[PDB]
Design a protein around this ligand. Structure first.
Ligand SMILES: CN[C@@H]1[C@@H](O)[C@@H](O[C@@H]2[C@@H](O)[C@H](O[C@H]3OC(CN)=CC[C@H]3N)[C@@H](N)C[C@H]2N)OC[C@]1(C)O
Length: 268
């Protein structure tokens, strides 16, 4: 019997979501199980749960981000530069690998979209415009990003059947951690500025592992390491949303822990 919107709202209330909250969801729809009207049922429940003064923030990225195609070059390679689609925030599909629910979030009426094509964030609520802009190339997840503003606004991270690697806000801890050997990446994104397509090349922190030892593709990254150590140590509201085991995490607290975690393990 598929979960109804009102059943999900009650479960979110049980978990500790309150009207007015600013929530960042990370969702496994397979863990959630069948929904009355598909993924939209959970989007609707999240919006009801946070109320008209609350907010939803999601890391949605872009299905067609030219990340690997431009990585490590000081300019987009010519064949990429000449034909890649410009990122059009109100028309760009979410990256499917960060959750199929994100395409439902970002197409929700009134949803806003940040201008960083690879780190793109989607936001719903009165603070959505303040959350999504600015989002400059060179500020993907650290200071001046939407995640930084989320962290300054008592954000809660809502993990709904998702693994400990799916805690994007921890990339803020990596950005500001005073440790040696931090990995950086250089890539190019095609933006729209006044309807004109403009290639921007930038460097930023490597979001696939802030240090070498965390960036092997067949091992856990720093986000997962930090998140597992935090969840092993911290009382966190836990309970079902649909069929999925869920956690409601204080975003400022886990990011503070992560900064401490990184700085304790690596010299300045
Ligand atoms: C759309 N462009 C993408 C580009 O943004 C970047 O995505 C990052 C992404 O992997 C990270 O998620 C995975 O991280 C790891 C360890 N590597 C294991 C499983 C995931 N939790 C996320 N935390 C931060 C993202 N920025 O690289 C891939 C890409 C497809 O090119």
């Amino acid at each position: 019997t598929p979960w109804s919107k009102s059943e999900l709202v009650r479960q979110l209330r049980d978990l500790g979501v309150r009207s007015g909250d600013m929530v960042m969801p990370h969702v496994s729809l397979r863990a959630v199980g069948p929904l009355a009207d598909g993924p939209q049922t959970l989007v609707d429940a999240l919006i009801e749960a946070v109320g008209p003064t609350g907010n939803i923030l999601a890391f949605v990225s872009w299905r067609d981000s030219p990340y690997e195609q431009t990585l490590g070059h000081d300019a987009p390679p010519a064949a990429i530069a000449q034909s890649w689609p410009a990122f059009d925030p109100d028309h760009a599909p979410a990256y499917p690998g960060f959750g199929a629910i994100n395409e439902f979030i970002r197409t929700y009426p009134g949803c806003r979209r940040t201008a960083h094509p690879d780190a793109s964030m989607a936001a719903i609520g009165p603070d959505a415009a303040w959350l999504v802009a600015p989002h400059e190339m060179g500020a993907a997840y650290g200071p001046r990003s939407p995640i930084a503003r989320f962290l300054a606004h008592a954000g809660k991270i809502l993990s709904i059947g998702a693994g400990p690697d799916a805690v994007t806000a921890l990339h803020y801890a990596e950005a500001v951690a005073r440790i040696e050997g931090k990995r950086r990446v250089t890539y190019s994104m095609p933006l729209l500025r006044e309807g004109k397509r403009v290639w921007v090349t930038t460097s930023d922190w490597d979001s696939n592992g802030i240090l070498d030892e965390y960036a092997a593709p067949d091992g856990p990254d720093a986000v997962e390491r930090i998140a597992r150590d935090y969840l092993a140590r911290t009382r966190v509201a836990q309970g079902p949303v649909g069929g999925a085991q869920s956690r409601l995490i204080d975003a400022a607290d886990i990011v503070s822990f992560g900064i401490e975690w990184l700085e304790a393990r690596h010299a300045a």
